[PDB]
Amino acid sequence: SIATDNLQCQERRQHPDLVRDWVEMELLKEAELIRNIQELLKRTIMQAVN
Amino acid sequence: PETFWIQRAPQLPGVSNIRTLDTPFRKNCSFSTPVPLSL
Amino acid sequence: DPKEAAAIEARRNREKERQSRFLNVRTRVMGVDVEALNSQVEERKLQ
Amino acid sequence: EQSLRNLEDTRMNLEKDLAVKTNSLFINRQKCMTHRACYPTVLQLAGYQ
Amino acid sequence: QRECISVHVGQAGVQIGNACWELYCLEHGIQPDGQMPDDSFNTFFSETGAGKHVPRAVFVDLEPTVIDEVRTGTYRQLFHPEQLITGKEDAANNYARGHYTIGKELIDLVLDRIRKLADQCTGLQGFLIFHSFGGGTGSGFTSLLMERLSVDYGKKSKLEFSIYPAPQVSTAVVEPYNSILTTHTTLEHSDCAFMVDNEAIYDICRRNLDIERPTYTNLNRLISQIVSSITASLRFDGALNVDLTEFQTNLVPYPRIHFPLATYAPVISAEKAYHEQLSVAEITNACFEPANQMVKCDPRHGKYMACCLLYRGDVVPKDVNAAIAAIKTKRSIQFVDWCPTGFKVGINYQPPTVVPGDLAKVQRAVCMLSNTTAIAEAWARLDHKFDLMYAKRAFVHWYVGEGMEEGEFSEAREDMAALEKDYEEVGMDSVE
Amino acid sequence: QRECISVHVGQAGVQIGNACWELYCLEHGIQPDGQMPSDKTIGGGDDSFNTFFSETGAGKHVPRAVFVDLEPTVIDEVRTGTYRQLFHPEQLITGKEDAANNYARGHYTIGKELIDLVLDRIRKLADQCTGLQGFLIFHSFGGGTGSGFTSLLMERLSVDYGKKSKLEFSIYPAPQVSTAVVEPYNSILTTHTTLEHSDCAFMVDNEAIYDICRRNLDIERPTYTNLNRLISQIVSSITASLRFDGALNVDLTEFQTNLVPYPRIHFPLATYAPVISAEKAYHEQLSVAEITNACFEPANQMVKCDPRHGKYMACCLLYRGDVVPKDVNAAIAAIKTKRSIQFVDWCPTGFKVGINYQPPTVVPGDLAKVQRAVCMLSNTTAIAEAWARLDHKFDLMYAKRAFVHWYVGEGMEEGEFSEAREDMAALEKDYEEVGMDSVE
Amino acid sequence: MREIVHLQAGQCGNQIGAKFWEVISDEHGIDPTGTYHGDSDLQLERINVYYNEATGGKYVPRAVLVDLEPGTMDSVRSGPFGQIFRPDNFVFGQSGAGNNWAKGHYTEGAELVDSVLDVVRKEAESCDCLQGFQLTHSLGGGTGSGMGTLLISKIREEYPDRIMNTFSVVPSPKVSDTVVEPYNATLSVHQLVENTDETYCIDNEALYDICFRTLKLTTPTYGDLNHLVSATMSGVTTCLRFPGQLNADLRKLAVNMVPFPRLHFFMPGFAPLTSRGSQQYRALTVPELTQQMFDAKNMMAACDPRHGRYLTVAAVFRGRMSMKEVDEQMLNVQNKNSSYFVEWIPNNVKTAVCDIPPRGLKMSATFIGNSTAIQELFKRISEQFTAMFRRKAFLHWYTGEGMDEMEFTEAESNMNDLGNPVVTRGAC
Amino acid sequence: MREIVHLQAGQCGNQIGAKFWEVISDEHGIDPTGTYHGDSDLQLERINVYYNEATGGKYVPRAVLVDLEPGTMDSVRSGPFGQIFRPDNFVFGQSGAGNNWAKGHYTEGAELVDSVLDVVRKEAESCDCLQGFQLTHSLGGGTGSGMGTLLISKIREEYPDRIMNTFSVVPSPKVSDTVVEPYNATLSVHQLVENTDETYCIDNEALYDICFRTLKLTTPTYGDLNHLVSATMSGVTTCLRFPGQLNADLRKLAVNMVPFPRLHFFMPGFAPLTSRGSQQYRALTVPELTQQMFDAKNMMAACDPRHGRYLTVAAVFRGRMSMKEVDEQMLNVQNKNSSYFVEWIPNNVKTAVCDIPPRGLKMSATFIGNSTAIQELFKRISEQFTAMFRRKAFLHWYTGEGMDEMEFTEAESNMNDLGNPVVTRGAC
Ligand SMILES: Nc1nc2c(ncn2[C@@H]2O[C@H](COP(=O)(O)OP(=O)(O)OP(=O)(O)O)[C@@H](O)[C@H]2O)c(=O)[nH]1
Ligand SMILES: Nc1nc2c(ncn2[C@@H]2O[C@H](COP(=O)(O)OP(=O)(O)OP(=O)(O)O)[C@@H](O)[C@H]2O)c(=O)[nH]1
Ligand SMILES: Nc1nc2c(ncn2[C@@H]2O[C@H](COP(=O)(O)OP(=O)(O)O)[C@@H](O)[C@H]2O)c(=O)[nH]1
Ligand SMILES: Nc1nc2c(ncn2[C@@H]2O[C@H](COP(=O)(O)OP(=O)(O)O)[C@@H](O)[C@H]2O)c(=O)[nH]1
């Protein structure tokens, strides 16, 4: 939630600010890492209940 | 300056509370800070 | 008649800013309304 | 007079860019860091270990 | 019901009054007409069953002019056309003229008005008198007035804010004579004579407020901010509050030792303020510094007999408790032994009001009423001057003329002697 | 909690303090108008400015300092230039008539119109400090203000705050080159009056910085800007452990407990490490051993006195940045195995190590970016020759009473020169008596 | 059925008992309007101690609010639990105490105690069995010490067989808010010696120190001190308000802490106190309660009990707890601290337990200490009194109101005559 | 159940015991936040030796955290296991150590020792039987010397029949972090001798030698230096925390290792140590353990046992192992090295074996040795003290805090009167 809200918030700025800085790609990497955690944990819970 | 200290900083013995982000070697005299003299 | 019954209300409200302003230690001690103070400078300069 | 209007345009867009930069501080500082500061800790991400 | 008649007597009075009633009016939002554009105002304002709030004061000058400006000013409909009594001939810098000649033709109307404004008071706390010690009316009239008030309003306090003659500057030449003959009027007919002195305020304004060229307006506003703190507990609510009688109980040690000195703390100028925290510690320390006192006198040349720290704003007991401890551990501040606990504390809530002038908007502020023995200095300088002339018999002719025997002059000096001796032997360490 | 109050006397002191406070503001992040732009949110954090800067209502960090000069325009540069909004308007204190290279005018006639004001400001500064660790007194041994008013400040501060520590950072007159004709007079007089009132006095000679700026910084035409900036780096190193955290948090009382063996011997030599000018950072590895050896080399000293003609008593090494305990103890072992560095036989363990994890943040200017620094404070008896050269000059001038009429007619009595010379000679005799080896 | 009439005099006593009424009303389940909104029948079981029934189930506190200034009445009526008192119990005067004991005791205070006595007589006669009275006041100042001691005296000869508990705020050495405070304190302690049955000496400094080293509050306010007073009041009146094993009311607290009729000045203590950041480190049980009680940091009087011998000690616990766990701790303190307890009173600790704990907690325990160390307060007040009295400092304001010299001298001498037995019992 | 009150003084002691609590909570399965998440029921069987139980299944370490600089407490609270200690146990004072024994022993140190003793008395009377105390400090410098030895004296006076282990970091010959190490060590050893029961001398020379020669670290720092001391701290107190065959607690080590009351200075060692490059070449067995224990490269003091006869040796093994190997190897060491052991104590080697090893390791062993070779450690300090004392160096502030020349002379004389017994017992 924090990563998604921060990314959606930082997506808009003024015209001479909005860049692909050293913030946007770290937020995207955090979102991807959170996602991979999510499906890996789903799979691990499935093996656990099996 | 990138040092061995600044890599191992949240595990070093003599490092105070890292409340900020740039240098972990700031000073965070907030726990000591006697209760009558505290904000 | 509603006056005395509103005097209590008045106090209650005037005693709802204390539990906020005072509570913040960094306000009870060092306290300056930058805004009002800034004006006094500009006004004194105009004067 | 041409020089004066040239400096005047420079001041115009300088205040433009300053307001732009200040609202960038507002969106970076007041929104995102404050919403980030409630991040859960290592033990909670481990699952109450 | 905590009413307080304010008898302003003399040019000084009418002018210190102007500032005072302006701060008063804004403090309790009351337009210069007398119409609020809850009961925190009865101390100084009476309601004429219509919303009109008339001031509870009696401006009195044995000459017109000074008051006539207020009658044709912005505060013209506020004051009652009769509260402002004015005479028709100045007292010509002469205690005699203002006490035995031109004043005996205005005292009656003043006392009548005072009773008219002392009947609409359910519980008059005390009278506040603002006069100068070096003028005709200021000395003569206040003398006559305070004497007649003593025989009448006897069990009511009679505080006296005065402008003791300067210790170097001075504006008159007959000043010493008038100030020495008004001693047996602030020693045995007053309940707490807070004496201030222009020379000092000039410095307090030239070094703390940056006004390099102070006028009399930039001076009365300060005397007014001080009188507000000594009358706030009897107006706006607060924590540890302290009324008139209380200040006295915890300040006047013996009957003939009622000459406290005032000292407001946050006297900064919106500009040097940013570079200062302006906290209870600082405000407390200031009041206890010589270059901030309101009477050119070093409190280091004497022992504090008592002290009334009247705080006001966003101060908590915790802070006063601390600031007092630091002052109770400073080799400089030396207190008498016969006063162990020597700090009466008063914490109100309403912060200081700002009248478009100089002092900044301060969230916390403090006024101190201390009974130091370093007042003998001032009482001594003047006597030196009075003695330097009552030997060559200069100007004494005018007084005899306006009705007054030499005896008066002589006696006066002897009295101030007792006073000086007293306020100089009530400090010297004990022998047994 | 760890506050220290800096007071700067004279033109030398005021410009040194200007270069000091610029470095302090860049080290802590306070902008020239007194505002921290990195604590507007996620504030209530840092406390490292509390030894140098207070905190007021409008987020402003007022410096804990008093600039005093008996003559204006050197303070008017501060009140006009880029730091007019940083300092308090009343902390900067000026007179209106110059002391004019006269100890008598600085101490006896024009010091009394300002001593009460300076003491009032110092009193309020010490009142707004919980635990005061020390005064840092920045002055010179030259001019009349920086000698006489400094000595008056020592007397009054010893009266009022006799328990508190008073570190001096002072500009010594040149043994060879100099800039005035009464510098030996004022230097001997204020040496005599500050020997009994300074707890630890660091000495900085001008042509030593000239030589190390010519050699290490490649600046053939240096300026007092560079000189006081290097002094600023030295004092930022000495006040670094009561700013940040390290393995060996080493304090001012630690410094006093290791430098001075006896109460009279309180004059160390300061040295700094990398005086590199960024054309020299491509070729020096700047390892811990290199920065340790450059301190003990007799060419980077800030007083023109060779330590070969003297015995070290004790030295504090103050390491800053990427320094490893094995590297510092290897460097100390190499220093002890080196024979040219002599230590007194009555001090086997003559080292105190302080390690800080906060490397120096540079001013845009001369000095290069380094991950390592060390400030080396050595108490040595080799300062006796630097004393002796000004004693030779003072005797050579006082032999037939030159320039004495100014000092005498201003208000100072004649015996001051004789007692200053006698106490100075006694201090030197103490240096030889302490520096000789033990035979009993 | 037993009941307590609550008197509160002066500004200090008024806010102290206002916090007391707040804490006991929110213990017993009465809203600000006055109705019962609770969850157990035990809250209504013993409500006839502090609450008189009115129409419609609207319980009114059995309190008399006394002041010489009509501003503290406005403050209390504007308080959170302000619309609960009877308005006829708001007795006040359009006058001033002036922080003067003489002006509170020999003047308009005596002119207004007739109305105060009328209201306390009607509230103490609309009864069937009275336990006593609980007066809260400041020992230094006016009204609470001026008219307060006079109220103590006259209610004492009107009801000689009922218990009188005076919660008094003793003055302070280091920081004092008033100047004539040793005069007020000495004069008031003269009547407090031989009028009341329980005295609770609650200094402000000890409350401030508990707010710093125990509670770790960076904002200690008057309400935060008055709540610490109020918790102790609830702890001493809880056993007659709620059931439990080994109940103890005021009388069998009194018969156990008063060995001789003049040694009834206590130092109180409430001690399940812990900070917000250190609460979750605690292990709150009977041993932690015992350590927190018996430490010399949670005393509410500014006297170190290590400088004297404990005459008697009462421990009134509240909560579901074992009995052996209480008895062995009350044993262990006495056995291990052997020089701090008097030898001629064997097992000088009284144990009382109530089942119902205070809200938000599970185990509480209040402490009543009759210590030898209370002589420090009286000797210190006597020292300041002698220092101001040897020169007649601030004495004309008393001789004018009507006192004279030998009453001050007799008050000082009776303070020494109270210091003497608390010296003799401290060394047998 | 038995328990140990842990104490740590100075920056050195604070950091070493912080790493010690890290190590032992790793052993017992305690997370940073204080709760338990492990794998065996044999970890909470004896958790009440170092952890006081709190509410909600939390285990707060029993440790008193003492220093005179208000930054080391902050660093400990902000460390890895910072949110595990009691905030009340963080006892400190806003002052300076000044690396001064006088400033730690006759000043604000003595003004803080009362609050420290209050905390210690809390943790010592929250017990049923206390085995003793475990203080960690450094002799060279302030606080750990001054506060450390003052605490040693007062705790020994209050509790006179409890075991007491002091882990002292003693000054190092080749490099010295502070100048006045010989002064502080000379003034501290005199208090160490006739107070404590088990003193462990850990030297930075031997710590760095284990880091270099044995472990082959690249950049060794204070974390690893304190980790090596936490090794022996965990190893000594293992038989009363985990089950074993032939258990031996603190007193049963002290009886077998202290033949005379003056001789209790030991040289610790922990020896399943190997470099990461030599890790895959190991043959981990009890003979290899004894081989690494009894060499003069693992022993944690800068004293060579080749220069003195072994008075007593103790080997506390930790792992599932055969007792036949242990007994025969401890016999084989004594038989193959005959001149290195005293003859008047036949079989001067003691054996203890615990079953549960340290976590993540198959098998460990700790070494403790009382030897003649503790000569040099006190001797070098004695000549350095004599050299710095003949010329009165660094002493005016020592006498400014309130000492005398005769106390220095007595400290040197008692250093020599410790050296002479371990001279004479090294020569039959
Ligand atoms: N703030 C302020 N102070 C004033 C003003 N006018 C006079 N004073 C003070 O009053 C002093 C002189 O007042 P007086 O000499 O007594 O004047 P007076 O009361 O009218 O008496 P007469 O001269 O007889 O008319 C001066 O020294 C001032 O300190 C004023 O307008 N504003
Ligand atoms: N770093 C630095 N050193 C200075 C500066 N100005 C002077 N000095 C040194 O100080 C010595 C004399 O200067 P001061 O002692 O400050 O003279 P002063 O205090 O201004 O005395 P007056 O000239 O009478 O006002 C010279 O030998 C210089 O080496 C400066 O601006 N910066
Ligand atoms: N605990 C507590 N103490 C208070 C409170 N209000 C005042 N005090 C104390 O009461 C003292 C003075 O009260 P006092 O002058 O006697 O009030 P008075 O009885 O109306 O004259 C101060 O020193 C305060 O410390 C309160 O609300 N709670
Ligand atoms: N083992 C170990 N030793 C340390 C550590 N930190 C400091 N030391 C040692 O402690 C000694 C000095 O500590 P000291 O000055 O007494 O600290 P203080 O007690 O707070 O004054 C140095 O010689 C270091 O070798 C650490 O983290 N681990």
Tokens encoding E4: 């307080």
Q: Which of F288, F380, F363 is nearest to F20 (CA)?
A: F363
> In one letter, which amino acid is G12?
C
Cβ-Cβ contacts under 8 Å for H387 (sequence gap 6 or more): F345, F346, F347, F348, F438
Between CA F394 and CA F423 the distance in angstroms is 14
Q: How far is F41 from chain C (nearest CA, A)?
A: 14
- Beta-carbon contacts of H95 under 8 Å, excluding residues fewer than 6 positions away, are F131, H68, H69, H70, H108
Q: Which of F104, F88, F103, F95 is nearest to F74 (CA)?
A: F95
Q: Between the CA of residue F298 and those of A3, F147, F212, F334, what are the distances in Å?
A: 58, 28, 11, 17
CA distances from G109 to G87, G95, G134, G395 (A): 20, 9, 19, 19
Evaluated on CA atoms E142, E148, E153, E156, the torsion sign reads positive
Q: Residue F248 has what DSSP assignment?
A: B
Cα–Cα distance measured from residue G391 to residue G399, given in angstroms and rounded to the nearest whole number: 14
Residue type, D2: Q
Check CB contact of A30 with chain D, cutoff 8 Å.
no
> Between helices H181-193 and H375-390, what is the axis angle to 10°?
130
Q: Which chain B residues are Cβ-neighbours of C26 within 8 angstroms? A: 39
- Beta-carbon contacts of C13 under 8 Å, excluding residues fewer than 6 positions away, are none
Burial class (CB in 10 A: 0-12, 13-18, 19+), G334: middle
What DSSP line would sit under G279-308, residue for residue? STT---SHHHHHHHHHSTTS-SSS--GGGS
Ranges of H-type helices in G92-180: 101-105, 108-125, 146-158
Q: Nearest residue CA, atom 15 of ligand 4?
A: H141
* Joined tokens for residue H293: 């224990």
Final resolution, Å: 3.7
How far is E251 from G243, CA to CA, in rounded Å?
53
Give the CA-trace dihedral at G240, G245, G251, G254, to 10 degrees: -130
* Distance of alpha carbon F188 from alpha carbon F178, whole angstroms: 15
* E and G touch per CB criterion (3+ pairs under 8 A): yes
Nearest to H152 by CA among H196, H92, H184, H88: H196
G55: which DSSP letter?
Answer: T
Q: Is the C-alpha dihedral spanning H233, H235, H240, H246 positive or negative?
A: negative
Tokens of F74: 């050197």
As given in the structure block, the two tokens for residue H205 are: 């020379």
Chain centroid to Cα E368, Å, comes to 13
Cα E275 from Cα E88, distance rounded (Å): 51
Distances from the Cα of H275 to the Cα of B8, E421, H278, H281, H282, angstroms:
21, 90, 5, 10, 10
Q: Name the token pair of H23.
A: 């190590």
Q: To the nearest 5 percent, what fractions of chain B are helix, strand and coil?
A: 20, 0, 80
Method used to obtain the model: cryo-EM
Beta strand ranges found along E39-166 (DSSP E): 45-47, 53-55, 60-61, 85-86, 126-132, 157-163
Other beta carbons less than 10 A from residue G172's beta carbon: 20
Gap from CA of F64 to ligand 3 centroid (Å): 39
What length does chain B have?
A: 39
Å from E1 to nearest chain C CA? 15
Pocket of ligand 1 (CB under 6 A): E 10-12, 15-16, 63, 90-93, 132, 134-138, 163, 171-172, 198, 216, 219-220
Phi-psi sector, F232: left (phi>0), alpha (psi -120 to 50), beta:
alpha
Ligand 4 nearest-atom number relative to CA H202 = 1
The distance of H170 to chain G (nearest Cα, Å) reads: 35
Crossing angle (nearest 10°) for helices E376-389 and E406-425: 150
Ligand 1 centroid, distance to E225 Cα (angstroms): 19
Instruction: Determine the Cα–Cα distance for residues F32 and F78; give it in Å rounded to an integer.
Output: 11
Instruction: Check G387 against E338: CB less than 8 A apart.
Output: yes
Residues from chain H contacting residue F200 (CB–CB below 8 Å): none
For residue G277, the tally of other CB atoms under 10 A from its CB is 10
Query: Which amino acid, one-letter code, is at G38?
Result: G
Nearest Cα residue to B29 out of E332, F305, F44, H364: F44
- Could you give the dihedral angle defined by the CA atoms of residues E171, E173, E176 and E181, in that order, rounded to the nearest 10 degrees? -110
Residue E136 neighbours by CB distance under 10 Å = 30
In angstroms, the Cα distances linking G318 to G322, G347, H13, H101 are: 11, 21, 42, 49
Per the CB < 8 A criterion, the answer to whether F160 and F32 are in contact is no
CA of E174 to the centre of ligand 1 (A): 14
H48 contacts H40 by C-beta, under 8 angstroms = no
Name residue, tokens 């965070």: B28
- Greatest Cα-to-Cα distance within chain A, rounded to the nearest angstrom: 55
Q: What are phi and psi of H225, to 5 degrees?
A: -60, -45
Interacting residues of E247 by C-beta distance below 8 A, sequence separation 6+: E192, E230, E308, E310, E344, E346, E369
**DSSP structural state of residue E193:** E
Residue identified by tokens 């009087």 is: G301
Closest ligand 2 atom to F180 CA: 27
Cα(G107)–Cα(F195) distance, integer angstroms: 69
Q: Where is A36: in which H helix or E strand?
A: helix A24-49
The CA distance from H100 to G417, in Å, is: 50
What span, in angstroms and rounded, lies between the C-alpha atoms of F69 and A2?
Answer: 56
Contacting residues of D for A2, CB less than 8 Å apart: 35-36, 38-39
**Centroid of chain to Cα H91:** 21
Q: Do the two chains D and G touch, given a threshold of 8 Å on CB pairs and at least 3 pairs?
A: no
Beta-carbon neighbour count of residue E410 at 10 Å? 10
Q: Do B17 and H77 touch (CB under 8 A)?
A: yes
Collapsing DSSP states into helix, strand and coil, what is residue H4?
A: strand
How many other C-beta atoms are found inside a 10 Å radius of the C-beta of residue H288?
17
Q: Which residues, 6+ apart, have CB-to-CB distance to E239 below 8 Å?
A: E317, E347, E348, E349, G222
H or E element, residue E369: strand E364-372
| Six-digit token string for A32 | 């991807």
User: For residue G146, which of G403, G428, G418, G421 has the smallest C-alpha distance?
Assistant: G403
The DSSP letter of residue H374 is G
Q: What is the rounded distance in angstroms from the CA atom of residue F72 to the CA atom of residue G279?
A: 59
In chain D, residues with a C-beta closer than 8 Å to the C-beta of A16 are 17, 20
Residue type, G284: L
Q: Which of E352, E362, E126 is nearest to E226 (CA)?
A: E352
Chain centroid, CA F37 distance in Å: 30
C-alpha distances in angstroms, D21 versus A14, D14, D18, F31, F257?
9, 10, 5, 18, 51
Angle of CA points G16, G98, G14, to nearest 5° = 15
Which residues, including other chains, have CB under 8 Å from residue G406's CB and lie 6 or more apart?
A: none
Residue pair F232/F19 in contact by the 8 Å Cβ criterion: yes
Neighbours of H154 (CB within 10 A): 17
Element (H, E) at A25: helix A24-49
Measured between beta carbons, the chain F residues lying within 8 angstroms of E277 are: 54-57, 128
Report angle CA G224, G225, G227 to the nearest 5 degrees.
65
C-alpha closest to that of G75 among E309, E349, E43: E349
Cβ neighbours for F153, distance < 8 A, ≥ 6 positions apart: F7, F9, F115, F118, F137
Alpha carbon nearest to ligand 3 atom 23, residue: G177
Q: What angle do CA H311, H314, H318 make, to 5 degrees?
A: 165
Residue H327 CB partners (closer than 8 Å, separation 6+): H351
Helix residue ranges, H only, F304-414? 325-337, 384-398, 404-410
Put residue E28 in one of left, alpha, beta given phi > 0 → left and psi -120 to 50 → alpha. Answer: beta
- From the CA of G68, give the closest atom in ligand 3: 20
Please state, as a whole number, how many other Cβ atoms lie within 10 Å of the Cβ of residue D28: 17
Residues E141, E104: Cα–Cα separation, whole Å: 8
Residue located nearest, by CA, to atom 25 of ligand 3: G204
Inter-residue contact F383 to F267 (CB < 8 Å): yes
What does the alpha-carbon distance between residue G13 and residue G167 come to, in Å, rounded to a whole number?
8
Burial class (CB in 10 A: 0-12, 13-18, 19+), G375: buried
Chain position carrying tokens 């105390």: H133
Residues with a CB atom less than 6 Å from ligand 4 = B 13; H 10-12, 15-16, 67, 69, 97, 99, 138, 140-144, 169, 177-178, 204, 222, 225-226, 229
> How does DSSP assign F279-320, residue by residue?
SSTTT----HHHHHHHHHSTTS-SSS--GGGS-EEEEEEEEE
Do strands E304-313 and E364-372 pair parallel, antiparallel, or not at all (unpaired)? antiparallel
How many C-beta atoms surround the C-beta of residue C13 within 10 A?
Answer: 8
CB E133 within 8 A of CB E11: no
Flag whether C touches G (3+ CB pairs, 8 A cutoff): yes
Pairing of strands E192-196, E157-163: parallel
Residue pointed to by tokens 């960038």: D24
Strand F3-9 relative to strand F65-69, pairing: parallel
Using beta carbons and an 8 Å cutoff, which residues of D are at the interface with A?
Answer: 17, 20-21, 23-24, 27-28, 31-32, 35-36, 38-39
Residue among E108, E58, E98 nearest E82 (CA)? E58
Q: For tokens 């309403």, what's the residue?
A: E350
Best of F53, F54, F56, F86 to mutate (most E CBs within 10 Å, chain E)? F56
- Per DSSP, the residues of H262-317 read T--EEEEEE-----SSSGGG---SHHHHHHHHSSTTTSSSS--GGGS-EEEEEEEE
The Cα H14–Cα H30 span in angstroms is 20
Q: Is the dihedral of CA E116, E117, E121, E124 positive or negative?
A: negative
Write the CB contacts of G167 (distance below 8 Å, at least 6 apart in sequence). Answer: G13, G16, G134, G135, G136, G137, G200, G202, G229, G233
H296-319 b/e with 16+ CB inside 10 Å = b? bebbbbbbebeebbbbbbbbbbbb
Q: Which ligand is nearest to the CA of E9?
A: 1
What lines the ligand 2 site, CB under 6 Å?
A: F 10-12, 15-16, 71, 98-101, 140, 142-146, 171, 173, 179, 206, 224, 227-228
Q: Does C24 touch chain E (CB under 8 A)?
A: no
User: In chain H, which residue's Cα lies nearest the Cα of B5?
Assistant: H221
Contact by Cβ (8 Å): F355, F317: no
Dist. CA H172–CA H204, nearest whole Å: 6
CA distance G131 to G162: 6
Q: What is the enclosing helix (H) or strand (E) of H255?
A: helix H250-257
Q: Please name the residue that has the structure tokens 């470095």.
A: F23
Instruction: Give the list of residues 6+ apart from residue H416 with CB closer than 8 angstroms, or none.
Output: H382
Rounded CA separation B28/B31 (Å): 8
Are F344 and H169 in contact, with CB atoms under 8 Å apart? no
State how far the Cα of G84 lies from the Cα of G21, in Å rounded to an integer: 10
Tokens (6 digits) for E388: 């330097």
Q: Which amino acid is at E249?
A: T
For residue E57, give the 3-state DSSP assignment: strand
Pairwise CA distance, residues H383 & H412, whole Å:
10
CA G368 vs CA G2, G254, G329: distances in Å: 22, 10, 16
Which residues of E have a catalytic role annotated?
246
Supply the Cα-derived Rg of chain F in whole angstroms. Answer: 21
Q: With contact defined as beta carbons under 8 Å apart, do E313 and C21 qualify? A: no
